[PDB]
Design a protein around this nucleic acid. Structure first.
Ligand SMILES: [Mg+2]
Ligand SMILES: [Mg+2]
Ligand SMILES: [Mg+2]
Ligand SMILES: [Mg+2]
Ligand SMILES: [Mg+2]
Ligand SMILES: [Mg+2]
Ligand SMILES: [Mg+2]
Ligand SMILES: [Mg+2]
Ligand SMILES: [Mg+2]
Ligand SMILES: [Mg+2]
Ligand SMILES: [Mg+2]
Ligand SMILES: [Mg+2]
Ligand SMILES: [Mg+2]
Ligand SMILES: [Mg+2]
Ligand SMILES: [Mg+2]
Ligand SMILES: [Mg+2]
Ligand SMILES: [Mg+2]
Ligand SMILES: [Mg+2]
Ligand SMILES: [Mg+2]
Ligand SMILES: [Mg+2]
Ligand SMILES: [Mg+2]
Lengths: 110, 109, 102, 8, 46, 56
RNA sequence: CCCGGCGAGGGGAGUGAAAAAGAACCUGAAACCGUGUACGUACAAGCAGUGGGAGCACGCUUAGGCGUGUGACUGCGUACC
RNA sequence: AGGACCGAACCGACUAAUGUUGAAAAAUUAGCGGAUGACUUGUGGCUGGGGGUGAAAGGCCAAUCAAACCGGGAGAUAGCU
RNA sequence: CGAAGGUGUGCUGUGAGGCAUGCUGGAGGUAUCAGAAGUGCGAAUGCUGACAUAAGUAACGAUAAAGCGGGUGAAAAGCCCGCUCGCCGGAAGACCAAGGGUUCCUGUCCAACGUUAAUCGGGGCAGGGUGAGUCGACCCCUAAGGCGAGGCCGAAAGGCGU
């Protein structure tokens, strides 16, 4: 794999995390923070972690020390959603799907 | 309030017997073969651990969370050990700082 | 079924090593034939935490079907499909179709 | 007790 | 308000369930059809 | 207040327009050749020039 | 072995014929949800197609007037049971 | 003395607002009636379905009552959808 | 030297469909003519499961609101320590019965459960923890009522009762 990292579960819904992801693409890499470290939404704290793990895989699976790179890809997918119940009007309006995603960050060449 | 600088001294203070008759008996209910595994001829590892620390700078001995592969491939080059050997010391040390912080009077119960 | 007991010195058949010596083995009723002539390196890391922290990254058995060179005395194979008689009370193992019980 | 902990 | 239940072990025998079942044709019948027919781990008395 | 046929696709995908997130852009400040965060001097020590929070 | 909270999760290395078999594990379809690219699209009214149709992106051929995608504009034109 | 008076506990529910995918499958808030009596309450017992109980409303008999719940006759019958 | 199945493509038939083949796939399939059907779905407010929509909307459970400094920690508005502040006090305190059945205490861990975070918990995993001649139950005694030798009734079941 051209240095990835991705995720799975944890729980943070799709769209929720899909929002912060758009913030980072193209340049990225050297943007391991700032364009992320200066935005607080749970989704952000999650993409950064895996962001670093990914950029870290640049010293193991492949060479090219952290400084170049690009991050030409970032997309979140819907991950199995947990189910639960919710006491309400005798039991009619209750479904609650926790939802969850990943991130799947990438870092190739420009 | 604790680091490698203090942990190293604990090794030098082993001049007097070092436990050749102390720690060797601090396990009446030996687990079939726990003794020799701990002492290890008192040189198989008991001495190597010290050497690995001696080849460390004042900065590394102060901060254990600042050592990387660039430093691990250097200590083993001088001491004579390998990369995994130096890692074991850091691991056993990590469990020491966590223990020397959750107690007060003996820590017994 | 197998009858091939321990220390039973057999020879490798079917394939791979083949024509190899090997004896004893560790086959069991519906069990496995370690023998001695079936085993390629092995996979394993340093998990043992005992004073003997090894790696087991070597040594291992190579099951293989009981269908190995029958015991063999002179040449090879020599099926043991025969039954002795009036010997023992439990068993009465026979031997290759060459001679008699061995 | 120092040797009964660091070695324990 | 008062939701129709209110537990009381003692009030769970001759008055209902428990071992009292062994005192009537039907009572004892229940056990058969219950246990036998479709083996029930059952539990009745606790 | 009920609804009746609603198009998951296309529609909504339009309201999402006003939902994308945004970018900051700030300095490093003289001392910190990086962080400085937003309109702050620096968090490393929380000092604009000296004894403010903790510093030399 | 490496990122991480001595997390989760992953990335290598190794097992293996296969890990595009990793325990959520055979094959893995559909709804449904995304990232990428080609084209259409912010003065235009309606079962959204169908008939005509230019342009554009690729592909054509020793042109020869074509194939694939998309479809501005335009005649029609109110789902199934 | 008193099915006496006023009024907490306790018992009950006349009015309005809120709630009506509720905090709640009948309540909350502010008022309201009885409060030594045909009073009120704990524990246990007795009445069984065409049967019970009923200061009587067809009320109550486990969120079910112009004939309870569970299983069976049972794939009742349905010139109807 | 890749079957069924999934997915593309090309040719073919009037149509139901047929074939050839790329890829996936990891073991089976079946010309032909004949035989037998749990024999072909788009609807039945059809049955089961999965995923949408509304929508990142409402809501987060009494309007007794909380502020700050330390500690710990990856991170503290919520956890521990401290000083303030406010609320209840015929109780929003204490004890017991009923019922519950380890929820108690200590250590730990934070996936799921807590309508958020959680280092915290009645959550997970471990351990530990309820000591009686005088308190209670057993136990003597009997109430309502139940059961009931023999007995009286009653097709059977069974009802009544000394
Ligand atoms: Mg699979
Ligand atoms: Mg235009
Ligand atoms: Mg046309
Ligand atoms: Mg009066
Ligand atoms: Mg109203
Ligand atoms: Mg009131
Ligand atoms: Mg009064
Ligand atoms: Mg009662
Ligand atoms: Mg009722
Ligand atoms: Mg009939
Ligand atoms: Mg019917
Ligand atoms: Mg078949
Ligand atoms: Mg139809
Ligand atoms: Mg919000
Ligand atoms: Mg709305
Ligand atoms: Mg609104
Ligand atoms: Mg609340
Ligand atoms: Mg428990
Ligand atoms: Mg507790
Ligand atoms: Mg607990
Ligand atoms: Mg009687």
């Amino acid at each position: 794999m051209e240095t990835i990292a991705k995720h799975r579960h944890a729980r943070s819904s799709a769209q929720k995390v899909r929002l912060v992801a758009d913030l980072i693409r193209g340049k990225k890499v050297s943007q391991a923070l700032d364009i992320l470290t200066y935005t607080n939404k749970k989704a952000a704290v999650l993409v950064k972690k895996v962001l670093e793990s990914a950029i870290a895989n640049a010293e193991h699976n492949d060479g090219a020390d952290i400084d170049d790179l690009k991050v030409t890809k970032i997309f979140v997918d819907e991950g199995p959603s947990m189910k639960r119940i919710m006491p309400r009007a005798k039991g009619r309006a209750d479904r609650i799907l926790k939802r969850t995603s990943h991130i799947t960050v990438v870092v190739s060449d420009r | 309030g604790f680091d490698l600088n203090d942990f190293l001294e604990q090794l030098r203070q082993m001049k007097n017997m070092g436990g050749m008759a102390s720690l060797m008996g601090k396990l009446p209910g030996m687990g079939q073969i726990p003794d020799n595994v701990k002492s290890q001829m008192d040189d198989k590892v008991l001495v190597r651990m010290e050497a690995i620390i001696n080849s460390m700078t004042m900065k590394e001995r102060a901060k254990p969370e600042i050592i990387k592969g660039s430093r691990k491939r250097r200590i083993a080059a001088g001491s004579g050990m390998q990369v995994q050997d130096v890692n074991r010391l850091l691991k056993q040390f990590d469990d020491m700082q966590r223990m020397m912080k959750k107690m007060k009077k003996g820590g017994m119960a | 079924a197998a009858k091939i007991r321990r220390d039973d010195e057999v020879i490798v058949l079917t394939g791979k090593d083949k024509g190899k010596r090997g004896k004893v083995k560790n086959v069991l009723s519906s069990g496995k034939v370690i023998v001695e002539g079936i085993n390629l390196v092995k996979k394993h890391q340093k998990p043992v935490p005992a004073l003997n922290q090894p790696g087991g990254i070597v040594e291992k058995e190579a099951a293989i079907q009981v269908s190995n060179v029958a015991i063999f005395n002179a040449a090879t194979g020599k099926a043991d499909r025969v039954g002795f008689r009036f010997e023992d009370g439990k068993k009465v193992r026979f031997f290759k179709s060459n001679s008699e019980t061995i | 007790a120092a040797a009964a902990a660091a070695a324990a | 308000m008062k939701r129709t239940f209110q537990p009381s072990v003692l009030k769970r025998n001759r008055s209902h369930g428990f071992r009292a079942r062994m005192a009537t044709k039907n009572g004892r019948q229940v056990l058969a059809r219950r246990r036998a027919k479709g083996r029930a781990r059952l539990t009745v008395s606790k | 207040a009920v609804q009746q046929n609603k198009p998951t696709r296309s529609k909504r995908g339009m309201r999402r327009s006003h939902d994308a997130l945004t970018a900051v852009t700030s300095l490093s400040v003289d001392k910190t050749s990086g962080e400085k965060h937003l309109r702050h001097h620096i968090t490393a020590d929380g000092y604009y020039r000296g004894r403010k929070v903790i510093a030399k």
